RNA sequence: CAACUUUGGGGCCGUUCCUUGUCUAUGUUCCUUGGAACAGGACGUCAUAGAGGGUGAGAAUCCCGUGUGGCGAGGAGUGCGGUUCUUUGUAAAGUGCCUUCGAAGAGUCGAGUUGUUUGGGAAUGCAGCUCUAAGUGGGUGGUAAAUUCCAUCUAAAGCUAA
RNA sequence: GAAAUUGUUGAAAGGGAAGGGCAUUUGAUCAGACA
RNA sequence: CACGGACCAAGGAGUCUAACGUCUAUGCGAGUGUUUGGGUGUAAAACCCAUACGCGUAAUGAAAGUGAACGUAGGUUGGGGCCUCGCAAGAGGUGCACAAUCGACCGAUCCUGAUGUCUUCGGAUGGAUUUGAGUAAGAGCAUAGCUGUUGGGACCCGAAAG
RNA sequence: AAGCUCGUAUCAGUUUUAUGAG
């Protein structure tokens, strides 16, 4: 098992050290998920294109939950019409963080996610796939 | 907004003028980035040397 | 691949700063020597080979006589003025003909030509014509249109084609053993 | 000019500024807010008390 | 050099359109002012049918095209103009 | 600094440019200032050397004593003055080498190409 | 047939290019140590000059040089800018319309066979031997081989900057 | 101006071995603190 | 008792590169890559950049060639996490990824052979214990590091020979 | 070693019950 980071990215240890914090304090298993998300390497935090976003927005009772993830964020072209929703995640492209704001949802940070729903409260989570890889 | 900041002129005086930032400041620091960059990037400035 | 003894045959282009700052001064030399000239020949636009290539254009290397002559002077005064030539080359195309045309006449338009006697006036130079006439690739359509159909979907007239020319030795065969019966 | 904002979109081919991870660089006064502290059942000592 | 078909499924088929006209045409069901598309000069040679897209009446111009992507444009009404 | 294409800025090249320089260049590098006494009268700074000057020294251990060239050794790149010597121990005397940089000259020895000389460096002679 | 248009050759002097020669700032002030100050402290100065070297140890300010500009000297030189003397010229060139012709490289091209070579494969290139042509022709079109088209080109003679 | 190696002086030891290890004695030698 | 070792100093031996591959950090992220080259410069630097090219985004067959949604991009099961109920224990919904299974779609093999038709073309429909590393709301490009593989003298020295 | 899933987890160079082959 791990217990701490590889990376040399100082935000990212910082968001480590946030996190860490919480999962020790406050103990709702969605923040163990973050942070066993972020220790990761960048194959097994593969990125999250937005239509699957929207794919799982459109599970039942599924239209305010912020949704969240933890790897990075791509726009998609093969669809036109997106949700406005409240979404969070380490690295937003350019492109998505265009389309988001177009719809009028917002593209909102990690610790301004914590201030939000600490515990885990009215999220959820994608893991892009794996098995695109080679 | 982009707060304030103040000028100074060739003798120094804090003038009634001054200006706003330019939102780049605000961008981050990646001292790792910088280290990988710049002993990539000061090595471009070399010459062979062989026996 | 190295099974061979390559390790005294190795070129190592250290030498691309050097020769760039030198191939520079070059140019500013015989610019300086050529003072007033733009340093470069008015060259035509052309339409590529090779039909990945053939949307494009391409600056090619000389106009033509004909087109020369269309504007209505000859290679002979051209090549003084600062235009080029090809000669082997053969216009089949009436667009292309015009905008060459038009290059021309743009350029004829666009310079003074000084006498041979002088009185040498201030010329205060360019440094280069591509950039004033700059090839230029066409438009071929304005972003908006109406539809039209045809009711043909534009996949079976494909198919046909090539069923027409894979046959059509054999159906050629078929009318002249007809025709020539009796 | 040269190197963007918001407004001038860079002023050069393709490219914008990077994108901040987090609102800022602090954790203390992130954890120092209130409606995160409202969610923290509370600490120990964190320096035990030999037993035995 | 005969063997240039790279190939453009008609899921992206609007990224063609640079980001601003996009929204224009978007809003529009215009059968009389429809944009047109020049796979070629965009780099395509021939059309494969992957995607699903909206039914806006689109034109599109290219060389080769397959059964379902000539069908679906049809659908929204767009049409194929077979040049070489 | 150097701004320029074909002067040298490495010890390898000015040591050997110094050494084995010739005597014409020695001449050159062998220079002097003078009193402000003589720069107030003939507008200049510095000179070379020559046989004939009468001088003063200002820097190291025979400080304060003058007198006047006898010779000038420039395979040394020194100056011999007379009146500073050292005697031997068996009676017999030697010259002293000097670097004219460390001297100063209160009279010359002119000639007609010297007085063309400081009207060439800026002459208020006479 | 028709009217039109346009030219040359010398010297002189600048200028450019090279070779250079030469000139172009500011402390050697005070104190300590030391054999010696270029070291330490103070007080100062010049700076399109603090690159470098030297001199009795780390010297911008002691020297030579650097920087910045200028001043001349000797050469190549038509590169062009002014000059100056000649006048070509009933020469030469370009220009459209009508007509007639339009000459266009041989032991070479090409074919066989031998040997070598190429990434070149049912035979690319080269050299040798043999046979050896045509002019509404001839080569070439990377798979053989008969035929017919199509496309592009004009060989066996040649020069030349970067 | 190092080392092998060599000499003089000073100290010490020594019966067919020397060198090393644990502890200590004898002799030489030695740093720190008392305020 | 197989070999080397008298003594001391100094030297003295897994590196450098090209091309592939994994793992990781980073930039951008359906895009990615400034540096063959142009411009600019305090000059081998740094800074900017056009247009093309590469890789990837569609695969498959001997190839001619063809070419990815029936469905809320399928169903069933398990599935972190979230939501609801409950003080709790547990129940229910949603159920990403991942895995299994059943299906579908594409490409190919075999069979059928429709509307029409230059009467010999064309390929509508539906099937096979057939198959691809495919599709099924994209993820790679580039650089550096660690080490790997092959070939380069290749951990160093040392073979007679041609 | 890196991931994914479990977590009290499937287990054991082991006995006992039962029952085989030998």
């Known amino acids: ?134 | 907004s982009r707060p304030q900041v103040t000028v100074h002129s060739l003798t120094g005086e804090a003038t009634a003028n001054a200006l706003p930032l330019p939102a780049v400041f605000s961008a981050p620091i990646r001292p790792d980035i910088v280290h990988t960059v710049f002993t990539s990037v000061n090595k471009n400035k070399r010459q062979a040397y062989a026996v | 691949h190295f099974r061979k003894h390559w390790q005294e045959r190795v070129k190592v282009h250290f030498d691309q700063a050097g020769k760039k700052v030198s191939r520079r001064n070059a140019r500013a030399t015989r610019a300086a020597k050529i003072a007033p000239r733009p340093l470069d020949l008015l060259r035509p636009v052309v339409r590529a080979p090779t039909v990945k290539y053939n949307r494009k254009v391409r600056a090619g290397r000389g106009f033509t006589l004909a087109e020369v002559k269309a504007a209505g002077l000859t290679a002979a005064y051209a090549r003084t003025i600062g235009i080029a030539v090809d000669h082997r080359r053969q216009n089949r195309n009436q667009e292309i003909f015009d905008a060459n045309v038009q290059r021309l006449k743009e350029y004829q338009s666009k310079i003074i030509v000084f006498p041979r006697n002088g009185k040498a006036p201030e010329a205060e130079q360019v440094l280069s014509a591509a950039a004033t006439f700059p090839i230029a690739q066409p438009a071929t359509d304005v972003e908006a249109r109406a539809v039209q159909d045809n009711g043909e979907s534009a996949f079976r007239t494909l198919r046909l084609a090539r069923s027409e020319k894979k046959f059509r030795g054999i159906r050629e065969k078929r009318a002249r053993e007809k025709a020539e019966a009796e | 000019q040269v190197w963007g904002s918001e407004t001038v979109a860079s002023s050069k081919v393709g490219y914008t500024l990077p994108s901040h991870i987090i609102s800022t660089s602090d954790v203390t006064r992130i954890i120092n807010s209130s409606e995160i502290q409202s969610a923290i059942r509370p600490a120990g000592q964190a320096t035990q008390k030999r037993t035995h | 050099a005969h063997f240039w078909k790279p190939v453009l499924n008609l899921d992206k088929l609007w990224t063609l359109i640079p980001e601003d006209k996009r929204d224009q045409y978007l809003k529009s069901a215009s059968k009389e002012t429809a944009p047109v598309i020049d796979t070629l000069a965009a780099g395509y040679g021939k059309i494969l049918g992957k995607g699903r897209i909206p039914n806006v009446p689109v034109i599109v111009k290219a060389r080769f095209v397959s059964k379902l992507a000539e069908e679906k444009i049809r659908a929204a009404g767009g049409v194929v103009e077979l040049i070489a | 600094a150097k701004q320029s294409l074909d002067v040298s800025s490495d010890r390898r090249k000015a040591r050997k440019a110094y050494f084995t320089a010739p005597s014409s260049q020695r001449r050159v590098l062998l220079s002097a200032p003078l009193s402000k006494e003589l720069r107030a009268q003939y507008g200049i700074k510095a000179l070379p050397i020559r046989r004939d000057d009468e001088v003063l020294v200002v820097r190291g251990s025979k400080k304060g004593q003058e007198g006047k060239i006898s010779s000038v050794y420039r395979l040394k790149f020194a100056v011999q003055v007379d009146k500073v010597t050292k005697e031997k121990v068996n009676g017999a005397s030697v010259p002293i080498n000097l670097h004219p940089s460390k001297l100063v000259i209160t009279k010359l020895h002119l000639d007609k190409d010297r007085k063309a000389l400081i009207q060439r460096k800026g002459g208020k002679l006479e």
């Open chain 1, 1 to 134: 098992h791990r217990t701490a980071p590889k990376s040399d990215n100082v935000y990212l240890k910082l968001l480590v050290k946030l996190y860490t914090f919480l999962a020790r304090r406050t103990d709702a298993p969605f923040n163990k998920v973050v942070l066993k998300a972020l220790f990761l390497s960048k194959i097994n935090r593969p990125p999250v294109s937005v239509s699957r976003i929207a794919r799982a927005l459109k599970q039942e009772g599924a239209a305010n939950k912020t949704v969240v993830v933890v790897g990075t964020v791509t726009d998609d072209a093969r669809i036109f019409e997106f949700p406005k929703t409240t979404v969070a995640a380490l690295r937003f492209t350019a492109g998505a963080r265009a389309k988001i704001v177009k719809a009028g949802g917002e593209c909102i940070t990690l610790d301004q996610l914590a201030v939000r729903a600490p515990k885990g409260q009215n999220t959820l989570i994608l893991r892009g796939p794996r098995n695109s890889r080679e």
